[PDB]
Amino acid sequence: QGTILLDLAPEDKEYQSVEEEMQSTIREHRDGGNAGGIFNRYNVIRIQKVVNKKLRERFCHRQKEVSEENHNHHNERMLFHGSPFINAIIHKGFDERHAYIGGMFGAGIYFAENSSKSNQYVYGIGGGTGCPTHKDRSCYICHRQMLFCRVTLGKSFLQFSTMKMAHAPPGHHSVIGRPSVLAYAEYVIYRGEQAYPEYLITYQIMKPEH
């Protein structure tokens, strides 16, 4: 009736597959490292497969509705997600009702194909105040969490700013905010059921060597 978290052994292609997309999609942001910390690597501590019967039905049902509406193409993609509510999401699923609505963002649940971008949001908008214990946005101690999810994009509406809206334009099912002078892409959905929390990644950002 709940979520069963299955551990993937590091020696499995799947575990290697997930950590590679994580580690390789890192980049350097204009932030100066202020939001997500200064690092050029992650120490991956754990990768778990999230299993919830209900969650994948809700997810599959919505995915059929979108295919219906998209000339039978649901346009699913594997994207990263970061926010301070990861533990609620793996048990209750994604929820559009907890979704901000203004400031720089709006009405949606954001996803990124860059893991370093989803990391900026682990502790909050901009990094919040950092970790609960040392109020440091660049902690190398505390274990952070992020999700590598299945996201049904459907017909995506492409534009430059997202803070904008609260639902998707007519005929579309997602919004891709793209780069101007943003830096990287951001995928937004306005329905929780259009995304399934496939993998739970437990990790730390590593401190640069020398």
Residues near Zn ion, by CB under 5 A: 131, 133-134, 139, 141-142
Whether residue 131 is annotated as binding a ligand: the answer is yes
Size of the site for ligand K4F (CB under 6 A): 18
User: With contact defined as beta carbons under 8 Å apart, do 21 and 198 qualify?
Assistant: no
Interface with ligand K4F includes 65 (CB under 6 A)?
no
Nearer to ligand K4F, 67 or 185 (CB): 185
Which residue intervals of the chain are DSSP H helices?
A: 13-24, 53-68, 86-92, 115-120
Interface with ligand K4F includes 148 (CB under 6 A)?
no
Q: Please identify, among the stretches 43-51, 108-116, 162-170, 197-205, the one whose residues bind ligand K4F according to the rule CB under 6 A.
A: 108-116
Q: In what order do the strands lie in the sheet with 156-159?
A: 109-111, 186-189, 174-177, 156-159
Interacting partner of 139 out of ligand K4F, Zn ion, none (Cβ under 5 to 8 A depending on kind)? Zn ion
Nearer to ligand K4F, 8 or 146 (CB): 146
Q: In what order do the strands lie in the sheet with 4-7?
A: 4-7, 42-51, 195-205, 144-152, 76-81
Whether residue 142 is annotated as binding a ligand: the answer is yes
Interface with ligand K4F includes 105 (CB under 6 A)?
yes
**DSSP, residue by residue, 78-92:** EEEE--TTHHHHHHH
Question: Side chain identity at 2, as an amino acid letter?
Answer: G
Which residues fall in the annotated binding site for Zn(2+)?
131, 134, 139, 142
Query: Could you tell me which residues are annotated as the binding site?
Result: 131, 134, 139, 142
Residues in contact with ligand K4F by CB under 6 A are 83-85, 88-89, 92, 94-95, 98-100, 105, 108-110, 121, 124-125
